Amino acid sequence: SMYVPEQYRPRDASWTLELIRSNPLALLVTNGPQHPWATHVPVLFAEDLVGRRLLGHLNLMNPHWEALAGAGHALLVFQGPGSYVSPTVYETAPAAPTWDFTSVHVHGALRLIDDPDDLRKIVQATVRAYEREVGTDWDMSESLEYFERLLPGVRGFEIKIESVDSMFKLSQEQLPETVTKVIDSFRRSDGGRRQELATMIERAASD
Amino acid sequence: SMYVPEQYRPRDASWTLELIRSNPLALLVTNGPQHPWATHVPVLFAEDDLVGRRLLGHLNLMNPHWEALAGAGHALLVFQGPGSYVSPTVYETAPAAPTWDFTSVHVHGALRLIDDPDDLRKIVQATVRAYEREVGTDWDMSESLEYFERLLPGVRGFEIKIESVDSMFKLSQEQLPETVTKVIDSFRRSDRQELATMIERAAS
Amino acid sequence: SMYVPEQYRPRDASWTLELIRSNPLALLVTNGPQHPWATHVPVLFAEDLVGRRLLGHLNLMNPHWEALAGAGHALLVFQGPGSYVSPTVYETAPAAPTWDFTSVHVHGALRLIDDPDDLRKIVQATVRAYEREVGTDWDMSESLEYFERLLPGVRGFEIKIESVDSMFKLSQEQLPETVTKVIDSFRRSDRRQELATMIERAAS
Amino acid sequence: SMYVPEQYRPRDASWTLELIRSNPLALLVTNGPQHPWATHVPVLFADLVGRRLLGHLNLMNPHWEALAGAGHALLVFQGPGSYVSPTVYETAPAAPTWDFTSVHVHGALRLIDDPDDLRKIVQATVRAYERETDWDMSESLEYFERLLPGVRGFEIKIESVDSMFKLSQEQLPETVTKVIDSFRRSDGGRRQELATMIERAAS
Numbered sequence: 001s002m003y004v005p006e007q008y009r010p011r012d013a014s015w016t017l018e019l020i021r022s023n024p025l026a027l028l029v030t031n032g033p034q035h036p037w038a039t040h041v042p043v044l045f046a047e048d049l050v051g052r053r054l055l056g057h058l059n060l061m062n063p064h065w066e067a068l069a070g071a072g073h074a075l076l077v078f079q080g081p082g083s084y085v086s087p088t089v090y091e092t093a094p095a096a097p098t099w100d101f102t103s104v105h106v107h108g109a110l111r112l113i114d115d116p117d118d119l120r121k122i123v124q125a126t127v128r129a130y131e132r133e134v135g136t137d138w139d140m141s142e143s144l145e146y147f148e149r150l151l152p153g154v155r156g157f158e159i160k161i162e163s164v165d166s167m168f169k170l171s172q173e174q175l176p177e178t179v180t181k182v183i184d185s186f187r188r189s190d191g192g193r194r195q196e197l198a199t200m201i202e203r204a205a206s207d
Numbered sequence: 208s209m210y211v212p213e214q215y216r217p218r219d220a221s222w223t224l225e226l227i228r229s230n231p232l233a234l235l236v237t238n239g240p241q242h243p244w245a246t247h248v249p250v251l252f253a254e255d256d257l258v259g260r261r262l263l264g265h266l267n268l269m270n271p272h273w274e275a276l277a278g279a280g281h282a283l284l285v286f287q288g289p290g291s292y293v294s295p296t297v298y299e300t301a302p303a304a305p306t307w308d309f310t311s312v313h314v315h316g317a318l319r320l321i322d323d324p325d326d327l328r329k330i331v332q333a334t335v336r337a338y339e340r341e342v343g344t345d346w347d348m349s350e351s352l353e354y355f356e357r358l359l360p361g362v363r364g365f366e367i368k369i370e371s372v373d374s375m376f377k378l379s380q381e382q383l384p385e386t387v388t389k390v391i392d393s394f395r396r397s398d399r400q401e402l403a404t405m406i407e408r409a410a411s
Numbered sequence: 412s413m414y415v416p417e418q419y420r421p422r423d424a425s426w427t428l429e430l431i432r433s434n435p436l437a438l439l440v441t442n443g444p445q446h447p448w449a450t451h452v453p454v455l456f457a458e459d460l461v462g463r464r465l466l467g468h469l470n471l472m473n474p475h476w477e478a479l480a481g482a483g484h485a486l487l488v489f490q491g492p493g494s495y496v497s498p499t500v501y502e503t504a505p506a507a508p509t510w511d512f513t514s515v516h517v518h519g520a521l522r523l524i525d526d527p528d529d530l531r532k533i534v535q536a537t538v539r540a541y542e543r544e545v546g547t548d549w550d551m552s553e554s555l556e557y558f559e560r561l562l563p564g565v566r567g568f569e570i571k572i573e574s575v576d577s578m579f580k581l582s583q584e585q586l587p588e589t590v591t592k593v594i595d596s597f598r599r600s601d602r603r604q605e606l607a608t609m610i611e612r613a614a615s
Numbered sequence: 616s617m618y619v620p621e622q623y624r625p626r627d628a629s630w631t632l633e634l635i636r637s638n639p640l641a642l643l644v645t646n647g648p649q650h651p652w653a654t655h656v657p658v659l660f661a662d663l664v665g666r667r668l669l670g671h672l673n674l675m676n677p678h679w680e681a682l683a684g685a686g687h688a689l690l691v692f693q694g695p696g697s698y699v700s701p702t703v704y705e706t707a708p709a710a711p712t713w714d715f716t717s718v719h720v721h722g723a724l725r726l727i728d729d730p731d732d733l734r735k736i737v738q739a740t741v742r743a744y745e746r747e748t749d750w751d752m753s754e755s756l757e758y759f760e761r762l763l764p765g766v767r768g769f770e771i772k773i774e775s776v777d778s779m780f781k782l783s784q785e786q787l788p789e790t791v792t793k794v795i796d797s798f799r800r801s802d803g804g805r806r807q808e809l810a811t812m813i814e815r816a817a818s
């Protein structure tokens with residue numbers, strides 16, 4: 001499981017849920033010969049997280065799909081904004097650099113889905129979910145026929161969540177004044193995803 | 208290994224090396240009971256055509272993953288760069304399906320463990336220098352070396368001798384060039400600039 | 412190992428060596444998760460079979476290559492001529508149909524080759540050997556440059572033969588007269604020619 | 616899985632089914648200590664996913680006992696193949712290659728020892744192969760019974776199929792025409808059947 005120093009644990013579960021929804025392209029990781037299998041996959045909630053279900057899909061021709069048959073359990077890694085923290089920002093000495101970042105590791109029991117009806121439901125639900133969340137409210141109606149043409153090439157999976165580790169490493173180990181410097185320094189830069197990161201740092205520091 | 212459709216393969220090896228250096232906080236992944244171990248770790252080259260090179264890293268001694276690493280002969284390091292959801296609205300085309308444009312590198316290698324304090328000192332100092340030049344502000348650690356020493360007993364390290372590298376540069380290459388131009392433009396007009404640039408680079 | 416009834420065993424080891432050389436595109440088979448790995452590969456002897464070495468190559472991008480790391484031992488299956496044998500040919504009753512076929516399973520210790528010089532030697536030797544045996548004596552000099560361009564895409568293996576099972580199921584369970592009927596019937600049809608000759612050799 | 620470059624994938628599923636029926640003596644391959652088990656077995660059908668392949672083998676074959684510990688197995692079918700010498704290409708530079716046809720079926724393994732089921736399997740194998748000199752087994756049924764206690768069987772429920780139709784598609788159309796004709800001009804089995812398959816792929 002992911003080791004999270006106590007100071008980097010989320011103050012609210014909403015941080016975890018949001019991070020997952022905001023960054024639904026997870027890394028699906030299962031044991032393999034000599035090292036694990038790892039695939040970037042689009043997941044979404046089925047409808048505190050324990051017992052809920054994450055649905056996902058991937059390429060039928062991806063060898064990971066074949067490997068999934070021998071695995072009872074899996075890990076899904078979600079990552080949000082993150083960035084290097086240069087001590088120059090602290091304006092203090094001595095110091096050490098660090099990396100501020102956000103990530104959620106979901107542990108769960110794995111289930112395989114190959115029924116075309118279930119897969120249609122999944123891919124359509126993914127479009128709706130992403131379009132609302134990360135998207136532009138695109139209408140998929142005129143494309144449903146097209147989806148059918150694609151459907152035999154897709155396979156899916158379900159993960160019933162058994163444990164969740166949440167890492168919100170947002171400079172909380174720093175004094176409030178210094179954290180203020182880190183936030184401002186990230187806000188003064190245009191490079192993504194430091195704007196969003198700065199906002200998360202501020203959120204962790206507020207009341 | 209990571210399955211990469213031929214069209215999402217890097218046109219140049221420079222893309223891969225660059226992605227690694229720009230996003231050096233990698234995910235270290237090893238086999239574990241029932242499912243894998245995964246830890247976010249700061250990595251750097253020890254200084255593909257990367258096969259045979261060595262990636263060095265460190266982590267918390269008190270992290271259980273460190274205890275798990277003993278007995279792990281091989282490991283995976285996952286690097287991720289810019290990425291974003293791609294809505295069909297941007298395509299201005301029909302019919303369509305949405306997708307995700309993203310950049311990632313999975314390095315496979317043999318794992319070696321480092322617990323000698325001198326080797327750890329070199330690793331952490333080297334990490335500071337490399338990041339300060341690459342992602343940093345050219346910060347000077349001279350006044351903090353003493354502090355590093357107090358931290359040093361709490362850190363452990365690893366080396367991965369690279370045996371294979373998979374590079375995924377999913378940058379809308381499956382679209383028509385006019386459509387790709389629209390995706391680039393949508394990203395440049397949106398609050399995804401580095402990604403738009405990577406897409407344009409694949410498209411040139 | 413392959414179970415060979417005593418009557419289907421080769422009368423001379425030359426049958427086995429012959430079969431290997433005549434049909435060098437073998438099936439390389441190693442253990443894998445849930446079921447084995449199997450890839451068709453071009454092999455050749457390195458310059459009774461126990462202790463000798465078989466050399467081969469395959470696609471670097473073939474996932475099987477990744478699996479070969481971590482496999483101490485392997486099986487290579489060579490297949491020569493074979494055919495269904497319908498009881499009509501026997502002109503006897505009662506009977507059961509059968510299949511006459513020729514096969515050699517080589518068991519051996521596996522070693523991986525990724526050195527470019529060694530791979531160059533293997534592929535060139537493969538060309539020489541096949542052109543001499545199964546080819547038209549094509550001259551590769553003008554293509555050596557081209558080979559170099561291909562060379563980064565190829566990986567290789569060596570198997571040190573530890574055991575060999577030889578199946579020459581050629582109707583030896585039949586009366587000599589019946590065997591002649593099978594031979595002649597196979598000779599009248601156009602791999603039944605080569606097969607009829609092997610049956611005859613077993614009967615002679 | 617069998618790694619199949621896109622250019623060597625079948626244009627029609629009928630190629631895969633045809634190859635299976637024309638070459639029903641498959642290689643049954645399962646995991647074993649240090650390396651796999653491999654046995655040549657006569658199989659027949661009971662796109663391919665969800666279908667069932669039936670087979671039999673010798674009770675005294677140790678592979679049979681090994682089968683009880685295997686959840687899954689691989690069956691390998693091979694059709695015609697031949698070495699391809701660059702001389703036929705009339706091009707330079709070139710590299711030789713091997714043109715071949717193979718189908719690897721992955722599936723869940725089930726064991727059969729019921730005598731009635733074995734009778735059904737062996738008889739069906741006879742009918743199927745005879746049709747695919749149409750020999751009549753009527754007078755030999757009693758004989759089959761004498762043989763029956765010595766045979767054991769298996770079923771594979773197909774979960775995946777890899778199809779390799781390496782038929783010179785990587786060469787130019789003009790070149791493919793040359794390898795086709797060159798293979799047609801030779802009597803060596805099975806270059807005629809192969810030439811026809813290459814032609815079918817070029818169509």
Ligand code: HEM
Pocket residue numbers: 039040041042057058059060062123124126127130147148150151152153154210292293304305306307
């Ligand atoms: C709604 C209809 C959808 C259908 C019918 C569909 C179908 C497919 C198919 C056939 C593949 C196989 C390879 C390919 O064609 O790319 C695939 C893979 C993939 N799809 Fe979807 N998809 C849909 C929606 C989405 C959405 C909204 C996303 C959001 C990002 C997405 C992300 C992906 C990714 C990342 C892969 C690669 C999986 C792998 O690496 O194995 N898809 N999908």
Ligand code: HEM
Pocket residue numbers: 003096097098099246247248249265266267268270331332334335338355356358359360361362
């Ligand atoms: C660019 C510079 C650096 C970055 C980005 C960085 C990042 C990190 C990260 C992400 C971890 C957590 C690993 C885990 O989960 O187990 C960590 C742990 C640790 N590192 Fe570094 N680090 C840097 C420099 C240094 C230096 C110079 C030292 C000097 C000794 C050091 C000592 C430690 C120690 C003692 C721990 C474990 C205790 C703790 O987390 O505070 N690090 N580092």
Ligand code: HEM
Pocket residue numbers: 450451452453468469470471473534535537538541558559561562563564565618710711712713
């Ligand atoms: C008698 C001559 C040859 C035969 C019959 C032959 C056969 C084969 C076969 C069956 C494969 C597929 C292996 C797999 O599935 O992984 C392959 C792959 C490969 N071979 Fe050869 N080979 C020959 C000569 C050469 C030579 C001279 C080279 C020079 C470098 C070469 C380089 C390669 C490469 C780069 C691949 C990767 C995939 C491809 O391009 O086919 N081969 N060969």
Ligand code: HEM
Pocket residue numbers: 414495507508509510654655656657671672673674676737738740741744759760762763765766
């Ligand atoms: C007609 C009813 C059949 C019966 C009762 C029968 C029975 C048997 C028996 C008793 C064996 C044990 C070893 C032996 O005696 O050879 C065996 C194995 C075998 N049979 Fe059949 N058989 C029948 C049909 C066929 C057909 C049509 C074929 C087509 C080629 C065939 C091919 C084989 C092969 C290749 C083996 C060896 C399998 C191994 O290595 O374990 N049999 N069968």
Ligand SMILES: [Cu+2]
Pocket residue numbers: 001002
């Ligand atoms: Cu754990």
Ligand SMILES: [Cu+2]
Pocket residue numbers: 032033035036037208
């Ligand atoms: Cu793997």
Ligand SMILES: [Cu+2]
Pocket residue numbers: 034035281315370477480
């Ligand atoms: Cu490996």
Ligand SMILES: [Cu+2]
Pocket residue numbers: 001107108163242
């Ligand atoms: Cu867990």
Ligand SMILES: [Cu+2]
Pocket residue numbers: 208209474477
């Ligand atoms: Cu792999």
Ligand SMILES: [Cu+2]
Pocket residue numbers: 001239240242243244
């Ligand atoms: Cu674990």
Ligand SMILES: [Cu+2]
Pocket residue numbers: 073107162241242
């Ligand atoms: Cu668990």
Ligand SMILES: [Cu+2]
Pocket residue numbers: 035208315316371477
């Ligand atoms: Cu690997």
Ligand SMILES: [Cu+2]
Pocket residue numbers: 066069445446687721774
């Ligand atoms: Cu399987």
Ligand SMILES: [Cu+2]
Pocket residue numbers: 443444446447448616
């Ligand atoms: Cu496998």
Ligand SMILES: [Cu+2]
Pocket residue numbers: 412518519574650
């Ligand atoms: Cu052996």
Ligand SMILES: [Cu+2]
Pocket residue numbers: 066616617
């Ligand atoms: Cu496989």
